[PDB]
DNA sequence: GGCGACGTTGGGTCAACTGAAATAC
DNA sequence: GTATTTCT
RNA sequence: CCAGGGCAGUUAGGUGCCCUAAAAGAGCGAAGUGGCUAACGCUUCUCUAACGCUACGGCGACCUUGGCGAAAUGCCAUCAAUACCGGAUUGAAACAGUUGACCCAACGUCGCC
């Protein structure tokens, strides 16, 4: 369900990353063959096991032992543990896949070596933490493998699974040969009761987290094909009922958007709305957010939609996709784990993440100064300052 | 001896030699029957893996197996007639033996029949083309005669195609008929993502014997930007063409695609809840709109490339080994091969850097690729495009050997 | 926006096939 | 002749 | 900036007519993810809109042209369009198609910065 992927850099026979295992990935690609070869063996006594009778078949607990025996005795390589993980994975996709397989919607379902891991149970894999290096302390004695994490969420998520429960580890592989370490995770559940949400022309609506870098865009394509296809029907009807059904979608149309604010809010854990305040009823959707955010009592604000796009959201200048040239932020490319600028690669020297251009849009960087709590002082100690008037 | 195919949607669906009597619920007839083929399609992969993996001494004849997979299909689905059981053990068998040493080095997932728009696959000896009046008819046998006895219907599924193409008229009646004929093939009852039915008969014809010189190679350069150049290398003559909206369309389809999928989440109640099909219904329509603008694209370079050889007397066609550069070489080497020109592929190793006239090898040339202009020789400074001269470069025959003899002398 | 899991669809490559004799009804 | 099971 | 579709054999662009709040509404069911239930980018899913004539069976339904081409530079005539002013500009087609496999990309839900 839950799961992220850590890329590798290479296999250590110790935890300090010092002896590196010489012939790692040839090791690790034999190893993933043989899992496929052994979940492939036992799909197919699974399907043997099942085509059969089931008066004349033997009980579910001799068949998984039976299998595991076949497992072991195919491929003696194969450590316990994954022998009895590749049993466990084999016995879940024949549950879920065998009504398809009597059903003849697909074929026998087989381990290619991409979407064969070495599936790992969570007793045996310890993430640690050492300064930039990131290590994972399977039992395979046990190996230690370096895993460069590449994102700030994906070291947050690391962090929570090391001091979140681990699942299932996986070591899938891919086209060019490169491992991917999925650390699944489970969490407990909780659910929770400050955004911002800017308004364009045919952009829509556009929301931000004042907390959280959680984007989310209504791409008005609905809107602008309604407008340009009742445009042109009623370029028709003049050549050759609608203004009414224009005016109903107007009014149906901030429901599911007012919905969907709704259900941005609710997740992640955001209590507070404060949005934007006014060729399209915008006042009609203002108070249908205002009502149906009052449902799950969120309540919302009104501010005033003045310096709100052209305000940087990072450092707060005033000036008239989006850049502000007192930082760059539109310009500039930084590392998704550090945040820290630089002026060109793809790979951090701090961290050696990826490095993303910025891609702002001006409407998410109107929504991120929307969604700035009090933005009325922190606009009229900064408009003042520069002299700008707003009206008040 | 080439092949190609033809293509003809299904109008309707009859029970009649005179098609006065139609199946109501025909077009789900044929979905059952798509169904049916692709399950069984997928239980004889599944026999072939089950064979294949157990050790050679604990198996029955291959023979055995081909008979077992036949009467496995026949009795699963008795609705098959004999022909489209025969036909799909067949198909599973051609998969099963192109996939087989990936399956056994475990790099392929085994091959599963895509249940919709599952294409019925049907021997060239049952059904017959025939003409009654202006209608087009194929007389399909897609029922078993179990199933005609159960049901009362007959055996016999009359499709009126649709031919209303002088070029699709012509071939249909070339190949109707045996008395230069066509031969019939192996039909194919497959459907578009719009819901359309189609029948496809690949027909094998004679090759046309147009008397083009073998001597006269033409060579054929794809670029970046610049689509395709040709040259010719026994006359200073040559063509190129460039792709106009070559890109635009699949961004713009792309970009559709996009908007309408992320509007979902903002959608009404039916689309959010009424499953994944019901959500990408309105997706349905862009299903193939750049896959087969794709198609009419290269249809149309390869058409012109064959065309120029053609016209020419250009006997052979000169292909860089590597959009969709791969698919435009097939079109030409299965265009070309309708008129009986040889398609030699070689490598487009360092053939830019070459000069076309001197033969010499240079580096500073990989930075000027608007026009080429050899240093040494002049050939371009006394204008010449460098597509151009790839094309020339490689319409000389054997290029391969003399790139590998000139850089062991130099540049590597 | 991205880092991913699951899933699907939607573009590519790439390679082969695109029956016939015999046989029961 | 027609449809089916088989063989390549 | 005059959108998406349906028919016109396929595709792409038009075109002749029609439909559109299909970027839309609803129903059976449990093959799966979720908590025996049905919330789901839940389903072997299905229904939901579309050319003219008909004596209700069926019929018909258009264009992407021909050459010169030491070359995407264009020219000659011919067609269609222009929200440009009878001219000018723009575009001017071919059809080999199914399969499976692999790759990449995109999108839906979910977890998180
Ligand atoms: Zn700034
Ligand atoms: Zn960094
Ligand atoms: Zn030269």
């Given at each position: 369900?839950?799961?992220?992927?850590?890329?590798?850099?290479?296999?250590?026979?110790?935890?300090?990353?010092?002896?590196?295992?010489?012939?790692?990935?040839?090791?690790?690609?034999?190893?993933?063959?043989?899992?496929?070869?052994?979940?492939?063996?036992?799909?197919?006594?699974?399907?043997?096991?099942?085509?059969?009778?089931?008066?004349?078949?033997?009980?579910?607990?001799?068949?998984?032992?039976?299998?595991?025996?076949?497992?072991?005795?195919?491929?003696?390589?194969?450590?316990?543990?994954?022998?009895?993980?590749?049993?466990?994975?084999?016995?879940?996709?024949?549950?879920?896949?065998?009504?398809?397989?009597?059903?003849?919607?697909?074929?026998?379902?087989?381990?290619?070596?991409?979407?064969?891991?070495?599936?790992?149970?969570?007793?045996?894999?310890?993430?640690?933490?050492?300064?930039?290096?990131?290590?994972?302390?399977?039992?395979?004695?046990?190996?230690?493998?370096?895993?460069?994490?590449?994102?700030?969420?994906?070291?947050?998520?690391?962090?929570?699974?090391?001091?979140?429960?681990?699942?299932?580890?996986?070591?899938?592989?891919?086209?060019?040969?490169?491992?991917?370490?999925?650390?699944?995770?489970?969490?407990?559940?909780?659910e929770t009761v400050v955004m911002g949400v800017d308004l364009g022309?045919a952009k829509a609506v556009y929301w931000a987290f004042?907390?959280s870098?959680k984007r989310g865009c209504i791409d008005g394509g609905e809107i602008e094909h309604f407008?340009?296809?009742?445009?042109?029907?009623?370029?028709?009807?003049?050549?050759?009922?609608?203004?009414?059904?224009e005016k109903n979608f107007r009014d149906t149309i901030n429901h599911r958007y007012a919905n969907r604010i709704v259900e941005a809010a609710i997740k992640q854990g955001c209590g507070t709305i404060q949005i934007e305040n006014l060729?399209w009823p915008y006042y009609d959707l203002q108070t249908k957010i205002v009502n149906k955010a009052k449902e799950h009592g969120i309540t919302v604000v009104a501010?005033?939609?003045?310096?709100?796009?052209?305000?940087?959201?990072?450092?707060?200048?005033?000036?008239?996709?989006?850049?502000?040239?007192?930082?760059?932020?539109?310009?500039?490319?930084?590392?998704?784990?550090?945040?820290?600028?630089?002026?060109?690669?793809?790979?951090?020297?701090?961290?050696?993440?990826?490095?993303?251009?910025?891609?702002?849009?001006?409407d998410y960087?109107?929504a991120?100064?929307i969604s700035?709590?009090?933005?009325?002082?922190?606009?009229?100690?900064?408009?003042?300052?520069?002299?700008?008037?707003?009206?008040?």
């Amino acid at each position: 369900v839950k799961a992220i992927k850590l890329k590798i850099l290479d296999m250590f026979l110790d935890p300090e990353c010092t002896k590196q295992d010489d012939n790692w990935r040839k090791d690790l690609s034999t190893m993933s063959r043989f899992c496929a070869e052994a979940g492939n063996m036992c799909l197919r006594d699974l399907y043997n096991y099942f085509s059969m009778p089931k008066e004349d078949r033997i009980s579910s607990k001799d068949l998984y032992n039976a299998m595991y025996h076949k497992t072991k005795l195919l491929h003696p390589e194969l450590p316990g543990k994954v022998a009895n993980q590749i049993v466990n994975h084999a016995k879940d996709v024949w549950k879920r896949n065998a009504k398809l397989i009597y059903r003849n919607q697909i074929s026998m379902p087989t381990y290619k070596i991409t979407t064969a891991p070495i599936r790992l149970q969570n007793n045996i894999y310890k993430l640690i933490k050492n300064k930039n290096k990131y290590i994972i302390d399977v039992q395979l004695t046990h190996r230690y493998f370096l895993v460069a994490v590449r994102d700030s969420s994906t070291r947050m998520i690391f962090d929570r699974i090391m001091s979140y429960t681990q699942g299932q580890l996986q070591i899938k592989k891919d086209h060019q040969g490169k491992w991917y370490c999925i650390i699944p995770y489970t969490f407990p559940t909780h659910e929770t009761v400050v955004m911002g949400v800017d308004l364009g022309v045919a952009k829509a609506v556009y929301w931000a987290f004042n907390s959280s870098y959680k984007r989310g865009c209504i791409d008005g394509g609905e809107i602008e094909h309604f407008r340009k296809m009742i445009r042109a029907r009623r370029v028709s009807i003049q050549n050759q009922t609608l203004s009414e059904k224009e005016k109903n979608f107007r009014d149906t149309i901030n429901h599911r958007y007012a919905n969907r604010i709704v259900e941005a809010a609710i997740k992640q854990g955001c209590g507070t709305i404060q949005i934007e305040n006014l060729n399209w009823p915008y006042y009609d959707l203002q108070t249908k957010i205002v009502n149906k955010a009052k449902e799950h009592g969120i309540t919302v604000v009104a501010i005033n939609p003045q310096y709100t796009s052209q305000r940087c959201s990072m450092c707060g200048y005033i000036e008239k996709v989006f850049e502000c040239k007192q930082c760059g932020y539109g310009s500039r490319t930084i590392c998704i784990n550090c945040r820290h600028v630089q002026v060109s690669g793809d790979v951090c020297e701090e961290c050696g993440g990826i490095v993303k251009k910025e891609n702002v849009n001006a409407d998410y960087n109107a929504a991120k100064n929307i969604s700035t709590p009090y933005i009325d002082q922190i606009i009229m100690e900064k408009c003042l300052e520069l002299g700008i008037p707003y009206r008040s």
